[PDB]
Design a protein around this ligand. Structure first.
Ligand code: HEA
Ligand code: HEA
Ligand SMILES: [Cu+2]
Ligand SMILES: [Mg+2]
Lengths: 504, 104, 51, 52, 85, 266, 90, 76, 50, 38
């Protein structure tokens, strides 16, 4: 009854964290079938089924995108940490926060049920027509309705987050004293509210094309219109999944350096510039569909601008570590690893922005290596940095430092050996979304499938890190959740704290 | 900024503070990651050995030796054969194919 | 396939194109989306039903 | 006043303008409709059958 | 023409357009190498020189307007140098 | 129970002006109602027998859960749990929901602008397609625009009035004017010489006007629910203001809908 | 008391006191419980926040360097300044 | 809220450039060739060809003198 | 323990047999999350093999 | 006798960055990167 009828933010955030762990387990299971079909030339364990391989990659991409990183960063750490960090007693709409969580298990259930109906939804996670429309049966409708339910969940969560930050701050605390995780969650909520309904409209058009015999994307329609609407949604979507990671990395790096964050207003402005530029660059996913050269020209020139705010954020993190008193712990290694390895994920994005180069590497494994650098090593490292940072506060359990270092090194080795060879495959022209490849692509495919098993082993080793905790008493901190007891009370902040400005 | 550091170091007593960059000793970390890498290698080997339903005939040693006899040469239905990828294999521009070369 | 040929990549009927000549290629499709990609020539354009 | 005038000049006028079956008219990618044969709210189908 | 085993970079070309694309890619990679080298070397030196066994207590450094303007203005020049080709 | 109010005053009410809720069963029931209705909708698309009844069953359960949730919210308002800052937060949440619905309509009208502006060879590059007789602006649609502008002004009356009879009469006039916008859209949907299956023009027209009509119906029901709370205690608070805000949003949406579809023939 | 213009009437002043708490004259923080979290900014930097915990029956305590001293006092009512004492306007 | 630092206006120069370019690209599309709702637009061959070549040459004519000189790379 | 009004909303050292149920729940979570895709593979391939 | 807050930071320049040589390390990094790029 506690975990079904909750109105507290700390319980709903923990429910999000557990649901995100379940989604990560499902996606990791779906990702071993991909790398085990792709280990050797010919036909592997899927018995030469291409529809089943397409179903597997569709389900894997949708699950790891929407049901793992999004509920962990936005719904998980955001719901637990936002009202404590700003000093709010609760969320603004506590029963809306519960339906924000409780629309996610119906969506995941519909997505998993679509795999068992007819031949499944083998379309890719983008679901381009007329491939989505040609599929006889019911599975594609279930997958798109799963997408609708997840989108409505994210919209309602963003509504609650935006009213909470605006209207329930502590007295004396303006929008200058909030830590950078709060700013990241607020800008993420703004992006969600602006971008998700475009996807909802596009999927409504897809439903009417599939089932109502309409003419949105058909013989007499326009198939480029779907790609326009979908990528206008989908490129803000990948900055929704990465800004809370920036906030977490700011909090972690600031903590263990014994220093405040370098260039606070520059950090906020860089996050805002990233948020604003994400809505006008979306047709960098559509360089090969046959657009006019002026459109291609503008979207090439505009996409390269996003590098400058990100470079300022990275150099500001490095200046935060600079001239400090740094103690390297397990969450600290997950943030230094973030800084060193998100750079490798962004430099290839610069290459992909230039449309002349993108004529060669569109829909190859160069793209895949890029977006597994920025997601499996930017967002996953951000998720795991906060688990070893706030875990004793959130769950009450400590962790063994040695097994956590074992888990970190296993994950770090297993991801640098899975996707670094996928660059060379894509430069040599190996296409995406294929299970049988040419005989000369065998060596890097073997190395990548070797790396995936190391990744799976590090997934297994993570379950053995938890242990009992030691509880102490706080006196002072720089953020408001490190003066609370571990775990805090059900109504944390019994008295609402105020921020007093001194005579200076 | 120091007090939250000292509080986190008390709630996480297994994390050592001894004065070195890698605080956990490598004698603990290296054998366990080696064992994990070995288990991953065993899973990869099991997939390669026992989980294939069709091995291609173009990877048999007879096909491979007969291909290595030919080299990187492509046939044409309207022309003499041509050396594939002439820049990386350093074919000079005068030579177009095997048969058109007719070695001196 | 037979030795000297490439597995997966080989077709039965090729496309014959002269060199040193300006060629117009009109790419389209009949049922779903496709893409005509030849990485040696630097050409990759999507085949869209109607375009 | 004009809407109350409109409510009395409603379903009384008729159109007999039959439309030939053009490729963009009466799309039937899936046979029929989920509720029947004709469209919803459609009591007087216009596109012609038996196209001479 | 056709891909090769253990291949790193692009295939060989038969048009001037594709060779122009590959040359643009290598020109971008010229800048990327220097960016990654600077980031990795500075991260290593910051990690080694500011460990707590070396540092008695940290320094207060929240802002530096000159360095902020410098690392804002240098990558924008690189962006516009890349964009025109 | 008698000390539950005492405990609330001792620990929550006298310490901060924000509202802390007791545990509630309605979010979970609404989520699994969405699950049931999605299964019914997917079965009803492909003419599976007893699929439309299942979709109606799931929608009826969602409607009942939402009605009981909103009755609980109204009860909590009547017992004085909401201060002024809570009501300001209610209007802020309504503004965020309005922004989301606005971007939904922006994505919907993007399709009208794209498909109408550059007709394709499949249409023999003629917009509007031959056979299609488009709906004119010089007719019943202009009467609809007049009625909905009158509804805008009458809803604007009830926002500023202080006499309760004026507020009730203005709200009833706004609701009755909204009901005439929908009863006449039904007449357009019956007299129109095309279908949603006839060309992208008919497709975009019916989908966009249907979404607008659904929003008109939701706003009319929300204004009706805000009036009965005022008919009882002569006080509505955030229920009156947010319903007026939503109604003004619907009015502004009709300007874009009329000026893109009816005037621009897109 | 600091100027109460542009201050919300329920912010419970003592935070808006016109005093710099010294060792020999601390700022008395009222509280409904024996402990309370308060937040003090750096006197040389508005952007930096240190949150501390004051306890009932303790000596004066300074949170930031060169900052105010504080003493907690357990009370049954906290003056919700904005309609408690400026309506008095004494 | 706070005072924007000196970086954010160096940020705002290419951001304003990108926003202006986006507005211009959106504006110049309904004043182009294929955005005509008739087959009778192309029966006037002089005006159609003139409008289409005007749409061709704009923003390309700033690049013709370096297209002809193979300025397609940072280095040569 | 009193989760609503006690000092901690989660007291994991006071559930009886906590470390047994915790490992049982973790094992069940790993089992379901790693075995649901394999059941979906088995289900589709058993329909073609008919 | 009251509870005093401790001195928590040095001023930038007299702690452990006086012996770092920031510009020297940036010059070394740019030299190595430019050598590899060339
Ligand atoms: C969230 C993004 C994300 C992540 C993390 C991953 C992780 C991995 N992915 Fe990929 N992948 C995609 C996003 C991601 N992927 C997308 C979008 C596609 C395209 C689908 C389509 O085309 O439709 C794709 C497709 C894709 C391909 C291309 C297949 C094809 O082209 O057909 C390959 C090939 O190697 C691959 C492999 C892997 C491997 C070995 C990992 C490894 O990293 C394994 C995972 C290991 C982890 C450690 C991550 C799990 C994380 C947790 C368990 C943390 C949870 C913890 C808490 C919540 C506390 N996946
Ligand atoms: C975590 C999510 C995430 C993030 C943050 C990014 C970030 C970026 N991405 Fe990407 N991207 C994806 C997720 C993401 N992407 C996904 C999922 C796809 C495939 C979708 C699909 O089809 O399935 C994709 C594909 C994709 C494409 C389309 C290619 C194609 O599919 O054909 C492009 C093209 O422009 C692109 C570019 C960029 C750029 C320029 C950034 C920039 O934001 C990166 C900026 C960072 C840096 C540039 C490094 C830091 C900068 C410095 C250290 C300063 C030095 C820099 C310079 C001097 C320039 N990525
Ligand atoms: Cu993108
Ligand atoms: Mg593509």
């Amino acid at each position: 009854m506690r975990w079904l009828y909750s109105t507290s933010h700390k319980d709903i955030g923990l429910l999000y964290l557990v649901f995100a762990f379940f989604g990560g387990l499902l996606g990791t299971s779906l990702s071993m079938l991909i790398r085990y079909e792709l280990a050797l030339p010919g036909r592997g364990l899927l018995d030469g089924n291409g529809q089943l391989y397409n179903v597997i990659i569709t389900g894997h991409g949708i699950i790891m995108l929407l049901f793992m990183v999004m509920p962990a960063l936005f719904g998980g750490f955001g719901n637990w940490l936002l009202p404590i960090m700003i000093g709010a007693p609760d969320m603004a709409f506590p029963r809306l926060n519960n339906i924000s969580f409780w629309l996610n298990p119906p969506a995941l259930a519909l997505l998993l049920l679509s795999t068992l109906v007819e031949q499944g939804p083998g379309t890719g996670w983008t679901a381009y027509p007329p491939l989505s429309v040609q599929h006889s049966g019911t599975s594609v409708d279930l997958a798109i309705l799963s997408l609708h339910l997840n989108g409505l969940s994210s919209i309602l969560g963003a509504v609650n987050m935006l009213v909470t930050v605006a209207g329930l701050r502590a007295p004396g605390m303006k929008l200058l004293h909030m830590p950078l995780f709060v700013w990241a969650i607020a800008l993420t909520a703004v992006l969600v509210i602006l971008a998700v309904p475009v996807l909802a409209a596009a999927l409504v058009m897809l439903l009417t094309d599939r089932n109502i015999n309409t003419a949105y994307f058909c013989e007499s329609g326009d198939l480029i219109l779907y790609q326009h609407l979908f990528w206008f949604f989908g490129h803000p979507e990948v900055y929704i999944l990465i800004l809370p990671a920036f906030g977490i990395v700011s909090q972690v790096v600031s903590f263990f350096s014994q220093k405040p964050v370098f260039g606070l207003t520059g950090m906020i402005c860089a996050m805002g510039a990233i948020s604003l530029l994400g809505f006008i660059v979306w047709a960098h996913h559509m360089f090969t569909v046959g657009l006019d050269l002026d459109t291609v020209a503008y979207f090439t020139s505009a996409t390269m601008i996003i590098a400058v705010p990100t470079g300022m954020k990275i150099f500001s993190w490095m200046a935060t570590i600079y001239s400090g008193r740094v103690w390297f712990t397990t969450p600290m290694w997950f943030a230094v690893g973030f800084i060193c390895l998100f750079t490798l994920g962004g430099v290839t994005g610069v290459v992909l922005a230039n449309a002349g180069v993108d004529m060669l590497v569109h829909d190859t494994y160069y793209v895949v290596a890029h977006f597994h650098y920025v997601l499996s090593m930017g967002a996953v490292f951000g998720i795991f940095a906060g688990v070893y940072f706030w875990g004793n506060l959130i769950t009450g359990l400590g962790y063994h430092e040695g097994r956590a270092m074992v888990h970190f090194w296993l994950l770090f080795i297993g991801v640098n050996l899975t996707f670094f060879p996928q660059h060379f495959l894509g430069l040599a022209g190996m296409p995406r979304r294929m299970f049988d490849y040419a005989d000369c692509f065998a060596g890097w495919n073997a190395v990548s499938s070797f790396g995936a098993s190391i990744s799976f082993i590090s997934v297994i080793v993570f379950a053995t890190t938890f242990q009992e905790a030691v509880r102490t008493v706080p006196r002072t901190a720089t953020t408001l959740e490190w003066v609370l007891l571990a775990t805090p009370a059900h109504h944390a902040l019994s008295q609402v704290p105020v921020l007093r400005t001194a005579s200076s | 900024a120091r007090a939250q550091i000292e509080r986190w170091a008390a709630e996480h007593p297994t994390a050592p503070r001894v004065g070195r960059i890698f605080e956990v000793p490598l004698g603990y970390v290296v054998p366990r990651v080696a064992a994990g890498i070995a288990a991953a290698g065993c899973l990869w080997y099991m997939n390669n050995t026992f989980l294939q339903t069709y091995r291609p005939e173009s990877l048999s040693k007879e096909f491979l030796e007969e291909q290595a006899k030919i080299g990187e040469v492509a046939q044409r239905m309207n022309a003499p054969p041509v050396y594939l990828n002439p820049f990386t294999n350093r074919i000079p521009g005068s030579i177009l194919g095997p048969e058109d070369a007719k070695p001196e | 396939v037979q030795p000297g040929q490439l597995r997966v990549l080989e077709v039965d009927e090729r496309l014959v194109l002269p060199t040193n000549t300006l060629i117009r290629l009109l790419v389209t499709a009949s049922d779903v989306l496709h893409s005509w990609a030849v990485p040696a020539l630097g050409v990759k354009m999507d085949a869209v039903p109607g375009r | 006043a004009f809407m109350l005038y409109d409510f009395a000049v409603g379903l009384e006028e008729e159109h007999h303008v039959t439309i030939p079956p053009y490729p963009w008219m009466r799309i039937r990618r899936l046979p029929g409709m989920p509720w029947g044969q004709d469209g919803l709210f459609e009591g007087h189908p216009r596109v012609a059958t038996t196209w001479p | 023409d056709s891909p090769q085993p253990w291949q790193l970079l692009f295939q060989d070309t038969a048009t001037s357009t594709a060779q122009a694309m590959i040359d643009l890619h290598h020109d971008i990679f010229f800048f990327l190498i220097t960016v990654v080298t600077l980031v990795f070397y500075m991260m290593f030196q910051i990690i080694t020189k500011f460990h707590y066994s070396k540092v008695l207590k940290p320094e207060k450094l929240t802002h530096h307007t000159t360095m902020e303007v410098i690392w804002t203005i240098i990558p924008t020049l690189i962006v516009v140098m890349i964009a025109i080709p | 129970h008698q000390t539950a109010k005492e405990f609330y005053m001792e620990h929550i009410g006298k310490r901060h002006p924000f509202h802390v809720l007791p545990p509630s069963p309605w979010p979970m029931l609404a989520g699994w109602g969405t699950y049931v209705s999605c299964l019914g909708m997917a079965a009803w698309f492909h003419n599976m027998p007893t699929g439309g009844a299942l979709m109606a069953f799931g929608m009826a359960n969602i409607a009942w859960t939402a009605i009981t949730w909103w009755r609980d919210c109204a009860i909590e308002g009547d017992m004085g749990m909401h201060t002024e800052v809570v009501r300001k937060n209610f209007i802020s949440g309504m503004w965020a929901f309005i922004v989301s619905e606005a971007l939904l309509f922006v994505g919907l009208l993007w399709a009208c602008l794209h498909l109408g502006m550059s007709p394709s060879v499949a249409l023999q590059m003629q917009w509007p397609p031959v056979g299609i007789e488009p709906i004119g602006w010089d007719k019943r649609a202009l009467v609809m625009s007049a009625v909905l502008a009158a509804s805008y002004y009458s809803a604007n009356v009830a926002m500023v009035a202080k006499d309760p009879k004026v507020v009730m009469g203005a709200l009833a006039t706004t609701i009755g004017l909204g009901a005439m916008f929908l009863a006449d859209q039904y007449l357009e949907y019956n007299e129109t010489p095309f279908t949603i299956t006839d060309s992208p023009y008919g497709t975009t027209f019916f989908v966009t006007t249907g979404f607008h009509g659904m929003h008109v119906l939701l706003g009319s029901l929300y204004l009706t629910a805000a009036l009965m709370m005022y008919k009882r205690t002569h006080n509505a608070g955030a229920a009156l203001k947010s319903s007026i805000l939503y109604w003004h949003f619907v009015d502004i949406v009709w300007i874009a809908v009329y000026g893109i579809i009816y005037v621009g023939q897109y | 008391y600091r100027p109460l213009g542009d201050k919300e009437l329920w912010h419970e002043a003592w935070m808006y006191e016109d005093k710099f708490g010294t060792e020999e004259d601390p700022i008395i923080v009222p509280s409904l419980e024996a402990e309370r979290i308060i937040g003090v900014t750096d006197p040389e930097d508005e952007t930096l926040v240190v949150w501390g915990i004051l306890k009932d029956g303790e000596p004066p305590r300074q949170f930031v360097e060169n900052g105010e001293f504080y003493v907690l006092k357990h009370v049954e009512y906290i003056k919700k300044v904005g309609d408690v004492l400026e309506a008095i306007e004494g | 809220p706070f005072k924007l630092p000196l970086d954010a206006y160096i940020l705002m120069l290419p951001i304003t450039y990108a926003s202006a370019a986006f507005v211009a690209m959106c504006c110049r599309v309904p004043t182009a060739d294929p955005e005509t709702s008739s087959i009778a637009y192309y029966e006037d061959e002089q005006k159609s060809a003139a409008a289409a070549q005007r749409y061709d040459n704009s923003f390309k004519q700033f690049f013709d003198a370096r297209i002809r000189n193979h300025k397609v790379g940072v280095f040569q | 323990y009193d989760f609503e009004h006690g000092p901690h909303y989660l007291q994991p050292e006071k559930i009886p047999n906590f470390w047994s149920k915790f490992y049982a729940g973790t094992g069940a979570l790993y089992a379901v999350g790693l075995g649901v895709p394999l059941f979906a593979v088995w289900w589709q391939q058993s329909k073609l093999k008919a | 006798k009251a509870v005093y807050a401790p001195s928590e930071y040095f001023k930038y320049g007299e702690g452990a960055s006086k012996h770092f040589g920031f510009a020297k390390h940036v010059a070394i990094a740019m030299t190595v990167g430019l050598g590899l790029s060339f």
